[PDB]
Amino acid sequence: ADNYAATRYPIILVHGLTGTDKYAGVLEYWYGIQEDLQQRGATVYVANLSGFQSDDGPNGRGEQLLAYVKTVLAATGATKVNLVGHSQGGLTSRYVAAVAPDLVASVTTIGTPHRGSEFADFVQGVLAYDPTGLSSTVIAAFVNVFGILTSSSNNTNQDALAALKTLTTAQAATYNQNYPSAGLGAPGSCQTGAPTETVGGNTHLLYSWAGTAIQPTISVGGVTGATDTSTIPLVDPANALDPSTLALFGTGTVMVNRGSGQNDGVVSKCSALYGQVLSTSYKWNHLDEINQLLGVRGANAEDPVAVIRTHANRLKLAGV
């Protein structure tokens, strides 16, 4: 133990879709990461928001996170926080930075679909092929109940259809018009923006990274095949001991066949770009980014716990 990860402002880790601080009160979303950061001197809190909701709206994830930030400030005596968001949690973090800029010192996004996900477009599109619309109603009920059951607090504020819509590429483009950011490049650019923003006189340091395990590697007869670069081909024990490895290769294959390019299974490199882009070269699928499942990663995957820890030190050296 030391103070390598000690920052001026408390860190709040912000989960994305499906999430909660602890699934069924047993499985940490941010697997082993709060513990590691705290061992290295960080003051770290883990948000518990609706697993299924929009980020805007009076009962959206953004207002939930705002309320939580205020409780963390009251508990610590601090005046600002460092927000670190995974996936949709990066969009939630952007919301709080926009609406309460005085309460935020930095925003870091990990595998965040700032431009939406082609996989959400796919799923939403699939639902349109039920001319009765019953598929949407039934599956929404199923997923909403999953949210209530797995939420550590059995949060009943779950809206699976709104969550899915939120993550589509068309809706994300609208979100970016409603919640513009100096850290974002132009729509369609596959570029980032500035490394900082000043909003109402409050400067925020902006950062991101992306996983790109899923690479398009062959095109035959109009069909694109991918390679999971996180793994030793086929034989990697991560394919056996973490069911998300092959699942994300599967969804990543859908992604590349919708023109996504390199991706983590559900978020493309281009969609993930925000602020100071620290790396898009990690050989990670989407769950590797949060040390999941249960710390299992392919042999070629960098250690995500060390990456996050090093970033806490980066924040410390940057003055936040």
Taking the mean position of all CA atoms in its chain, how far away is CA 46? 14
Nearer to Ca ion, 63 or 288 (CB): 288
> Which residues, listed in sequence order, are joined to residue 223 by a DSSP beta bridge?
220
Q: Which amino acid is at 62?
A: G
Return the range that interacts with Ca ion (CB under 5 A); candidates 13-21, 107-115, 262-270, 288-296: 288-296
Q: CB 251 → Ca ion: shortest distance, Å?
A: 14
Q: What is the rounded CA–CA span in Å between residue 262 and residue 315?
A: 28
In the complex, minimum distance from the CB of residue 230 to Ca ion, in angstroms, rounded to a whole number: 8
Nearer to Ca ion, 159 or 288 (CB): 288
User: 55 Cβ partners below 8 Å, 6+ apart?
Assistant: 61, 62, 88, 91, 92, 94, 95, 166, 175
Provide, rounded to whole angstroms, the least separation between the CB of residue 249 and Ca ion.
Answer: 11
Q: Does 288 bind Ca ion (CB under 5 A)?
A: yes
123 assigned to a ligand binding site: no
> Out of 50, 54, 87, 181, which one is annotated catalytic?
87
Q: Choose the binding region for Ca ion from 20-28, 63-71, 148-156, 292-300 (rule: CB under 5 A).
A: 292-300
- Shortest distance, CB of residue 255 to Ca ion, whole angstroms? 17
Q: Which residues in the 133-152 window bind Ca ion by CB under 5 A?
A: none
For residue 244, indicate whether it is catalytic: no
- The residue among 112 and 285 lying less far from Ca ion, judged by its C-beta, is 285
User: Could you tell me the two tokens for 307?
Assistant: 């990456």
**In the complex, minimum distance from the CB of residue 13 to Ca ion, in angstroms, rounded to a whole number:** 18
Contact between 297 and Ca ion by CB under 5 A: the answer reads yes
Which two tokens mark 41? Answer: 């001197």
**Of the listed 15, 86, 114, 286, which one is catalytic?**
286
Q: Residues 118, 236, 242, 264: which binds Ca ion (CB under 5 A)?
A: 242
What is the phi/psi pair of residue 203, to 5°? -85, 135
Q: How far is the CB of 284 from Ca ion (least distance, A)?
A: 8
- To the nearest 10 degrees (0 to 180), the angle between helices 134-150 and 118-127 is 130
Tokens 């991918």 found at: 226
Our finding on whether 286 is near Ca ion (CB under 5 A) is: no
264 labelled catalytic: yes
Q: Does 296 appear as a known binding residue?
A: yes
Per the annotation, the verdict on 311 as an active-site residue is no
Q: Which region among 38-46, 108-116, 153-161, 241-249 touches Ca ion (by CB under 5 A)?
A: 241-249
CA atoms of 90 and 277, how far apart (whole Å): 14
The contacts found for 97-103 with CB under 8 angstroms, 24 or more apart, are 97/181, 97/197, 97/199, 97/204, 98/179, 98/181, 98/199, 99/62, 99/66, 100/66, 100/69, 101/199, 101/200, 101/202, 101/204, 102/200, 102/202, 103/66, 103/69, 103/70, 103/73, 103/79
- Candidate list 21, 121, 264, 268, residue with the active-site label: 264
DSSP label of 261: -
Sorted by sequence, the CB contacts under 8 Å of residue 155 that are 6+ apart come out as 20, 48, 49, 50, 51, 147, 148
| Alpha-carbon separation of residue 14 from 76, 153, 207, 235, 275 (angstroms) | 18, 16, 14, 34, 17
Judged by beta carbon, residue 139 or residue 246, the one nearer Ca ion is 246
Is residue 86 at the binding interface for Ca ion, with CB under 5 A as the rule? Answer: no
Contacts with Ca ion by CB under 5 A: the residue count is 5
Binding-site residue set for substrate: 17, 88
Binding-site residue set: 17, 88, 242, 288, 292, 296
Residues with catalytic function? 87, 264, 286
Interface residue list for Ca ion (CB under 5 A): 242, 287-288, 296-297
